[PDB]
Ligand binder design. Structure first.
Ligand SMILES: O=C(CSc1cn(CCNC(=O)c2cccc(C(F)(F)F)c2)c2ccccc12)Nc1ccc2c(c1)OCCO2
Ligand SMILES: CCCCCCCCO[C@@H]1O[C@H](CO)[C@@H](O)[C@H](O)[C@H]1O
Ligand SMILES: CCCCCCCCO[C@@H]1O[C@H](CO)[C@@H](O)[C@H](O)[C@H]1O
Length: 336
């Protein structure tokens, strides 16, 4: 049962892995990531060494949460695990945790290189994002920081959503920029809109220099809050500030996306509405005619509810450590 391990030093860091995994090579910035080859399956893989996983309660808690999350995410368009291992033989020697996933090689910038894509390519890429989003949203998880650097893409444009990555605010919902503390899943839809817009045009939709400039760019496009949106703002100061603004009309999107598929323009109008309750959901979007060539109602799976309460307890360091260890022990590789 216990595979044989071997040690070796990469970028000043000691890595201890099973023998199945050969030709380890660092690819960058928890911890550190090497591409490797998995001789057990024939697959190229990325391997992550968690950095200092059980050094403080907060490190411990974050480790547990990353492990839990990834073990529950099983979907073509969401990052998942092929393996999870520790050199340790027992809870007492347990101080390292390594996560294995399929090599993707590149994120969405790497694949796009600020260039305009064809409408077909655009449909395919956004479709996968929405298909992945539908899945995460069904588990009652909101991503909150969807951006191209949080999207793994390989040579054939097969795309996955990421928990954390390896400009950072250009994709954020305006309600997130303003630190509201109730949020819809549609904060994520907002981010899809900005991504899509960029892919159709070649240009960043809202390239602010800073927090306020970004909010000014957003207001130019989608106009100032109208009457329905105002009565939903509880903060009295926020409220008065907004009214103090000279009202501006929504731009028409046909003027902004000159010659794009009018179906592309339509969907984007449904993604980028200022009021979040009024934005298309990921499930409604997947049914939008723009994705006619890719939409399959029978292959857009949904997740079981993910208990977020287990991860936001206040446990001692050894409790988290032991719970993470069980999670390592109980792991089962996907069918392959
Ligand atoms: O291809 C992959 C796997 S998908 C990916 C994830 N991330 C977030 C960083 N996390 C990991 O890489 C990671 C590794 C193991 C386990 C896990 C866990 F989340 F826990 F499952 C995550 C990426 C960032 C950029 C591009 C792809 C990815 N990685 C990879 C491949 C080639 C690269 C590269 C990274 O860096 C650029 C040089 O070439
Ligand atoms: C909903 C509450 C919003 C508070 C934001 C108000 C603070 C914005 O103050 C802003 O700073 C910039 C110059 O420094 C300018 O671009 C703006 O015109 C100016 O009003
Ligand atoms: C410049 C003013 C920006 C307006 C941002 C509000 C648009 C988001 O929409 C609102 O946001 C909240 C989600 O956090 C919800 O509580 C509200 O129900 C929803 O209307």
């Amino acid at each position: 049962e216990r595979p044989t391990f071997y040690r070796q030093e990469l970028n000043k860091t000691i890595w201890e892995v099973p023998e199945r995994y050969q030709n380890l090579s660092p690819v960058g910035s928890y911890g550190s990531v090497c591409a490797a080859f998995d001789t057990k399956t024939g697959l190229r893989v990325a391997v992550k060494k968690l950095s200092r996983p059980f050094q403080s309660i907060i490190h411990a808690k974050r480790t547990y949460r990353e492990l839990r999350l990834l073990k529950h995410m099983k979907h073509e368009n969401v990052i998942g695990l092929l393996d999870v291992f520790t050199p340790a033989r027992s809870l007492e020697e347990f101080n390292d945790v390594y996560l294995v996933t399929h090599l993707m090689g590149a994120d969405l910038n790497n694949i796009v290189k600020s260039q305009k894509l064809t409408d077909d390519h655009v449909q395919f890429l956004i479709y996968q994002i929405l298909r992945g989003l539908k899945y995460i949203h069904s588990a009652d998880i909101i991503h909150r920081d969807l951006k191209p650097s949080n999207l793994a893409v390989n040579e054939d444009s097969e795309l996955k959503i990421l928990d954390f990555g390896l400009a950072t605010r250009w994709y954020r919902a305006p309600e997130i920029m303003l630190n509201w503390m109730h949020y819809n899943q549609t904060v994520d839809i907002w981010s899809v809109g900005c991504i899509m817009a960029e892919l159709l045009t070649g240009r960043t939709l809202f390239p602010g220099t800073d927090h306020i400039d970004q909010l000014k760019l957003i207001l130019r496009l989608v106009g100032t809050p109208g009457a329905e949106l105002l009565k939903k703002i509880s903060s009295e100061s926020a409220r008065n500030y907004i009214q103090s603004l000279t009202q501006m009309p929504k731009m028409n999107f046909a003027n902004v996306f000159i010659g794009a598929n009018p179906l592309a323009v339509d969907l984007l109008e449904k993604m980028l509405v200022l009021d979040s309750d009024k934005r298309i959901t990921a499930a409604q979007a997947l049914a939008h005619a723009y994705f006619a060539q890719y939409h399959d109602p029978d292959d857009e799976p949904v997740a079981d509810p993910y208990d977020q309460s287990l991860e936001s307890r206040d446990l001692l360091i050894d409790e988290w450590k032991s719970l993470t260890y069980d999670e390592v022990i109980s792991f089962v590789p996907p069918p392959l």
